[PDB]
Amino acid sequence: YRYTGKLRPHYPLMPTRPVPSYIQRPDYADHPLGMSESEQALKGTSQIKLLSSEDIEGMRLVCRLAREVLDVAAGMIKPGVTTEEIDHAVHLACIARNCYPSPLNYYNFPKSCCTSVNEVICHGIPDRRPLQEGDIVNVDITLYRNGYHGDLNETFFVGEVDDGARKLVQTTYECLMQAIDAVKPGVRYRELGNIIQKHAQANGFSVVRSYCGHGIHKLFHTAPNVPHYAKNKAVGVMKSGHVFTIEPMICEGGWQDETWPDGWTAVTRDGKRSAQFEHTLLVTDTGCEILTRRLDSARPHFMS
Numbered sequence: 235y236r237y238t239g240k241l242r243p244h245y246p247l248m249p250t251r252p253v254p255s256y257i258q259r260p261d262y263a264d265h266p267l268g269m270s271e272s273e274q275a276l277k278g279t280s281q282i283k284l285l286s287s288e289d290i291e292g293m294r295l296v297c298r299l300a301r302e303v304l305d306v307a308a309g310m311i312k313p314g315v316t317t318e319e320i321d322h323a324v325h326l327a328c329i330a331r332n333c334y335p336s337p338l339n340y341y342n343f344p345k346s347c348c349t350s351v352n353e354v355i356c357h358g359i360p361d362r363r364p365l366q367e368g369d370i371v372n373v374d375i376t377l378y379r380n381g382y383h384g385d386l387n388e389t390f391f392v393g394e395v396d397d398g399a400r401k402l403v404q405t406t407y408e409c410l411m412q413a414i415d416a417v418k419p420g421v422r423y424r425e426l427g428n429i430i431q432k433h434a435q436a437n438g439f440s441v442v443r444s445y446c447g448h449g450i451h452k453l454f455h456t457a458p459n460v461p462h463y464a465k466n467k468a469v470g471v472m473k474s475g476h477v478f479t480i481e482p483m484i485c486e487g488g489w490q491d492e493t494w495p496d497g498w499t500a501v502t503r504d505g506k507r508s509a510q511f512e513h514t515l516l517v518t519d520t521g522c523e524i525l526t527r528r529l530d531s532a533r534p535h536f537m538s
């Protein structure tokens with residue numbers, strides 16, 4: 235394997251962290267390949283759950299809890315902290331909230347969150363590497379409570395970063411918020427990518443294509459599939475009671491991605507930097523509720 239940039243995995247990984255048996259698990263948690271019966275059962279489906287009011291309530295609770303766990307992680311972003319240390323903290327913080335860390339053994343993903351540094355687009359596996367001043371780092375959190383999943387991420391600055399870092403991060407967030415702003419009943423899922431790319435390209439950035447936003451509720455990933463790039467073939471129309479994410483990944487250089495031999499880590503083929511943000515959204519009559527929004531601040535962490 236020829237790595238695309240300067241980052242290398244830092245093994246070995248600390249042994250898998252156990253989840254106390256009292257925590258409710260999703261179906262894949264103890265599958266040996268981390269497969270989810272329920273997700274496969276709807277694989278290739280185009281139909282989109284209309285959540286009931288109790289659904290909506292479970293979704294509100296788990297997304298607020300996931301936000302709380304992300305905020306715990308944000309509080310540890312500093313030079314010299316390892317992504318593995320971040321994950322240990324996240325893992326305890328899920329357990330303390332009585333939630334299962336959704337990423338754990340999801341298709342054998344071996345950690346409880348993703349930490350994606352610099353040229354890692356997404357799904358980085360927490361490891362022994364200490365964070366370096368100048369890095370950017372995304373932490374992606376997903377929790378499971380009472381049959382429901384809630385998913386969010388943000389990109390963070392590690393001490394001081396270069397203007398290009400600042401520009402990529404702010405721009406990515408602006409991409410996400412401009413997309414959310416278009417969310418309301420009657421809007422086509424494919425329109426979101428047009429809005430995202432339009433802003434990305436205007437700032438001299440490219441848009442990752444192999445990874446999409448997705449529906450989420452009782453399933454971790456399900457319809458709709460939501461591409462972040464222009465002129466895409468996404469199927470379906472927003473309707474009050476839909477829940478899904480938008481999570482653009484935006485790049486310095488080219489858009490092309492490839493995967494590390496670990497089977498998970500997605501990096502720029504060109505070794506240049508990528509940033510992402512994610513929210514879990516519910517479509518309401520007037521627009522949408524940002525179920526994973528920060529409550530103690532109007533803004534994401536990087537700009538506070």
Ligand SMILES: N[C@@H](CCC1CCCC1)P(=O)(O)O
Pocket residue numbers: 336337338340343348356357374375376385455481512
């Ligand atoms: N939370 C992230 C993916 C889910 C995890 C990636 C590694 C294991 C699951 P997302 O659905 O945003 O890509």
Ligand SMILES: [Co+2]
Pocket residue numbers: 385448479481512
């Ligand atoms: Co997601």
Ligand SMILES: [Co+2]
Pocket residue numbers: 374375376385386387512
């Ligand atoms: Co996520």
Ligand SMILES: [K+]
Pocket residue numbers: 237238239240241242353501
């Ligand atoms: K690399």
